[PDB]
């Protein structure tokens, strides 16, 4: 009784754990009460208990520092025993750990321990290990003497002492600066996938030992460099306790034939001797490149040696093999045969939210000025991966360091803690570093959840509903679809006049679902056609599956038909190399993949009709030009983020701009904005957009869709219904 399963915490603070409120109510303890946690090897830790809205009833959420003090790991169980008898401390003696205090000197109490404990009233027990961050260093301390025993609450009147040599770390304790799960920012879905596939066979092998089904044997991670492929594998090994054996291409390929295979198989033998263990092979494409590209003895023999070593995993119990490559098709396909590397995970490129979290991880030890805005940085760093954000934080720190160290002039082996304590990194130092940094993943397609929501689309209320029903009804009422033998549609084609929201509709449904949006534009379809590289379509569909839940949006389906003449035409017809691959892959998509395929075109009369055959883009939605009330909604949405004067009559403008699409009403809004900007600048050499600027803007904008085009679009819609 009173025992909970140890899980991850959200609050990084080292003196608190979080329980689900019903367990605090059964234990009759209040938020903020001090409790003891009973761990392994007759150890205990003292902490404050709070609660949150994410902890399960049977779980206790604690960070890495608390788990290390209890010598427990994620998945273990501890007992909770409230200790209201804890008294206030009179004198506490704290000394640093030598492993983290090297190269730094000065008064550690004034910089670290004092602000850490001051007015914090943290519970302290003799032998506790805790981390204090600051001055671009992470320093941990051990408590060696407490006047009250064995635990107390620190108070502003408690005497804090610190004299003596730094303490040498015990060999059974891991450093708090090691890689763990809290060092991974984005790609939480991929990390969860690894947890399921890896923790089970390493922690509970009995589920496979007594039965004829084998565990997963190998996981192939792929994506651009600097995305966390080695970070995830290392974090998992450290958190679970499995021995991490690091292998990489160059280390093996630099060796001579015979030696290279000996080193490879030796690592596998050591993994068993020290099992549980994870064998991680980085740059797998260097170990096992495509055979037709090489004839060397090392490149060919190392593949045969790796293939048989992977098969040996049947006997190498508690050992799993992971590898990293750039793309799933950059390695010898033999490694992906039954068994061996049976699972794969696409790490991808962190999105704006993930990039912010990555920056927050790197700045853990950094003192930031009040002007620093890491969210603004994360939004600007498009195309960057974690390796680039790590360099960004380092460069910003180095700029701040140079500015102050030129005045500090500390010439010695160690640096004072005080001078580091006052060193802050400003927004100008991040902006400077941003101008010097260069993204390593700018060429690859970036896929993320779009920010376009339903409030950004004027009109089309019936279309908004249909897109929501196509996701809610097939999953809430599967019995009714089966009852009548109907298969839910897995795609829709949008057609009609341009500038009415075709793209926004596909993004808005992805936004509300928190699904990834993959945007394929005309130039991309044309690049594959022109370069005779239509095989790349298979990669697009494969990315959509890995990105699930996602919306796979194929825009400008007529881009190739128009490139071939559109209204005139070259020596071909409606079908081409690229659409043929799309048609072939489309037939392989299932409603269970959580991928919704959306197409769009402004000329549906010139696209391969095969795409509309049953089983593909079965839904057909016509997007007409907006009516009067929709045009007003469009104007209001376009001006949602701008100051607008009260004299601006948006209904009056909408009444006149009868032929204007949403794209054309935006031009009017942006023209009025630009006019207001000129007025403000010239006045300095007014703070809101006045009617005069909208009235002039309307004199320059024109309708993009003519009356002839409206009839063409309506006739097509009526033809298909």
């Amino acid at each position: 009784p009173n025992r909970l399963i140890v899980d991850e915490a959200i609050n990084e603070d080292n003196s608190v754990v979080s329980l689900s409120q019903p367990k605090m109510d059964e234990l009759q303890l209040f938020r903020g009460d001090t409790v003891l946690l009973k761990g392994k090897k007759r150890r205990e830790a003292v902490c404050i208990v709070l609660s949150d809205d994410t902890c399960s009833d049977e779980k206790i959420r604690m960070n890495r520092v608390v788990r290390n003090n209890l010598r427990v790991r994620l998945g273990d169980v501890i007992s909770i025993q409230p200790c209201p008898d804890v008294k206030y401390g009179k004198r506490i003696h704290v000394l640093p750990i030598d492993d983290t205090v090297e190269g730094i000197t000065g008064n550690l109490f004034e910089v670290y321990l004092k602000p850490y404990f001051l007015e914090a009233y943290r519970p302290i027990r003799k032998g506790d290990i805790f981390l204090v961050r600051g001055g671009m260093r992470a320093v941990e301390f051990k408590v060696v003497e407490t006047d009250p025993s064995p635990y107390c609450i620190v108070a502003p009147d408690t005497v804090i002492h610190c004299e003596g040599e730094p303490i040498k770390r015990e060999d059974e304790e891991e450093s708090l600066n090691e890689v763990g799960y809290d060092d991974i920012g984005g790609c939480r879905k991929q990390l969860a996938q690894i947890k399921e596939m890896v923790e089970l066979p390493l922690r509970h092998p009995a589920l496979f030992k007594a039965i004829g089904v084998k565990p997963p044997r190998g996981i192939l991670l792929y994506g651009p460099p600097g995305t966390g492929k080695t970070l995830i594998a290392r974090a998992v090994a450290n958190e679970t306790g499995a021995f991490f054996f690091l292998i990489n291409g160059p280390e093996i390929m630099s060796k001579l034939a015979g030696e290279s295979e000996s080193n490879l198989r030796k690592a596998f033998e050591e993994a068993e001797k020290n099992a549980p263990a994870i064998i991680f092979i980085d740059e797998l494409d260097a170990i096992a490149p495509k055979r037709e590209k090489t004839h060397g003895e090392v490149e060919r023999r190392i593949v045969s040696q790796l293939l048989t070593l992977m098969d040996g995993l049947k006997q190498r119990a508690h050992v799993i093999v992971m590898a990293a490559t750039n793309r799933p098709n950059s390695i010898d396909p033999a490694l992906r045969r039954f068994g061996r590397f049976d699972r794969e995970v696409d790490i991808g490129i962190p999105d704006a939210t993930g990039r912010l979290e990555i920056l927050q991880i790197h700045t853990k030890n950094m003192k930031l000025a009040d002007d620093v805005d890491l969210e603004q940085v994360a939004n600007e760093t498009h195309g960057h991966v974690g390796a680039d954000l790590a360099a960004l934080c380092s460069e910003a720190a180095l700029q701040a360091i140079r500015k102050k160290m030129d005045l500090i002039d500390l010439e010695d082996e160690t640096i004072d803690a005080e001078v580091m304590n006052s060193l802050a990194v400003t927004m100008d130092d991040f902006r400077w570093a941003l101008s010097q940094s260069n993204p390593s993943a700018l060429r690859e397609t970036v896929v993320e959840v779009p920010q376009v929501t339903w409030e950004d689309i004027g009109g089309l209320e019936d279309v908004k509903r249909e897109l929501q029903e196509l996701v809610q009804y097939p999953v809430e009422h599967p019995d009714k679809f089966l009852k009548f033998g109907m298969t839910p549609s897995k795609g829709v084609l949008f057609y009609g006049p341009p500038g009415c929201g075709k793209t926004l509709l596909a993004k808005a449904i992805a936004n509300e679902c928190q699904a990834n949006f993959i945007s394929i534009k005309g130039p991309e379809l044309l690049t594959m056609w022109f370069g005779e590289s239509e095989a790349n379509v298979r990669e697009i569909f494969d990315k959509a599956r890995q990105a699930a839940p996602c919306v796979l949006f194929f825009d400008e389906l007529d881009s190739i038909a128009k490139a071939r003449g559109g209204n005139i035409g070259d020596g071909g017809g409606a079908a081409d190399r690229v659409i043929n691959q799309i048609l072939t892959e489309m037939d392989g998509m299932s409603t269970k993949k959580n991928v919704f395929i959306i197409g769009a075109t402004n000329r549906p009369d010139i696209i391969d009709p095969a795409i509309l055959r049953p089983g593909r883009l079965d839904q057909l939605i016509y997007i007409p030009l907006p009516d009067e009330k929709s045009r007003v909604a469009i104007l209001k949405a376009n001006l949602r983020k701008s100051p607008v004067a009260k004299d601006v009559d948006l209904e009056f403008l909408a009444k006149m701009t009868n032929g204007f699409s949403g794209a054309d009403l935006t031009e009017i809004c942006q023209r009025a904005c630009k006019l207001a900007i000129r007025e403000s600048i010239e006045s300095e050499i007014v703070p809101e957009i006045r009617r005069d600027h909208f009235e002039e803007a309307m004199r320059f904008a024109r309708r993009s869709v003519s009356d002839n085009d409206i009839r063409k679009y309506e006739m097509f819609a009526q033809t298909l219904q």
Binding site: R31, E58, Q81, D85, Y121, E512, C513
Partner: protein, 321 residues
């Protein structure tokens, strides 16, 4: 549950709360007729959205005569006005408020009908001082329904070191098959939750299930002398009632002190925030410390602060076991 009527000090049960407060508000007219009518408007009427609309419309009538006291057309509020009839006349206590702040209820000939109509006409006594209605308007606008005070049932406890002395069997750390099945299923479900395509409405149906558990809170205060002080509050009670609660228990109710929240965040007595807004609901432990103005004299004199609470409460200390 026991409650105290804040207007009389009477001891009430949960069912007697409205009956006694309503009567106490009607009695309060002998001390402050305006304050009694203000309490009557918010307390007797259960529909608080209609109470606010009636109060805003009354505030407008008072501003009209306040801004233009020289024009007699703003001295009379017509009880048959299409706005008055829906917003003000539908509430109990609004008629008494007009009389309390210097209006007389009279029947005046209509501008186009033989039948006299009902008006509240401001008298010369209050019209001569427009600042009187301005203050009465502010008193009504800042008002809220009167609720019986929850009996705090203050208790003092002494933690017993014996509660922390317990040895576990070694097998208590061996994860069971039932715990393993749930952990393995949760690993698969967590990946399925992130992998599945779902709209925000389908997500809300499950997420919203955790939002409605509590309406009361229990607070404990850790005193520097090792004693624990406990009492009960509304989930929406103000921080000032916790400071008053502690002041009542202290041997010296005037002696300045500070309270800290469950995370160490200092709470100031002058910050009139609700306990559910302070993060002290459904339960929390607060830390007690004497103000620096008090600690400086105790330390400078070499005194031992060996007494915090009244002897009348300390004689009733229970052990925590």
């Amino acid at each position: 549950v026991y409650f105290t009527c804040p207007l009389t000090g009477a001891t009430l049960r949960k069912d007697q709360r409205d009956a006694c407060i309503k009567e106490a508000i009607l009695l309060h007219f002998s001390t402050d007729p305006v304050a009694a009518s203000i309490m009557k408007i918010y307390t007797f009427n259960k529909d608080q959205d209609r109470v606010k609309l009636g109060v805003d419309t009354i505030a407008k009538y008072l501003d009209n005569i306040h801004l233009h006291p020289e024009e007699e057309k703003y001295r009379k509020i017509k009880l048959q006005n299409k706005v008055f009839q829906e917003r003000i006349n539908c509430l109990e206590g609004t008629h008494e408020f007009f009389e309390a702040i210097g209006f007389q209820k009279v029947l005046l000939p209509a501008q186009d009908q033989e039948d006299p109509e009902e008006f509240y006409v401001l008298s010369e006594t209050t019209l001569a001082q427009p600042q009187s209605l301005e203050r009465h308007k502010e008193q009504l606008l800042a008002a809220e329904p009167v609720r019986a005070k929850l009996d705090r049932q203050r208790r003092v406890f002494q933690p017993s070191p014996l509660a922390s002395q317990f040895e576990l069997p070694g097998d208590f750390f061996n994860l069971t098959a039932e715990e393993i099945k749930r952990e393995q299923r949760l690993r698969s479900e967590a990946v399925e939750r992130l992998s599945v395509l779902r709209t925000k409405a389908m997500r809300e149906k499950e997420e919203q299930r955790g939002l409605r558990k509590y309406n009361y809170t229990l607070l404990r205060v850790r005193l520097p002398d090792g004693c624990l002080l406990q009492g009960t509050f509304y989930a929406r009670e103000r921080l000032g009632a916790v400071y008053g609660f502690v002041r009542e228990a202290l041997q010296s109710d005037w002696l300045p002190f500070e309270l800290l929240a469950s995370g160490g965040q200092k709470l100031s007595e002058d910050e009139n925030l609700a306990l559910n807004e302070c993060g002290l609901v459904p339960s929390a432990l607060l830390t007690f410390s004497w103000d620096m103005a008090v600690l400086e004299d105790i330390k400078a004199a070499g005194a031992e602060p060996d007494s915090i609470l009244k002897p009348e409460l300390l004689s009733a200390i229970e052990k925590l076991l």
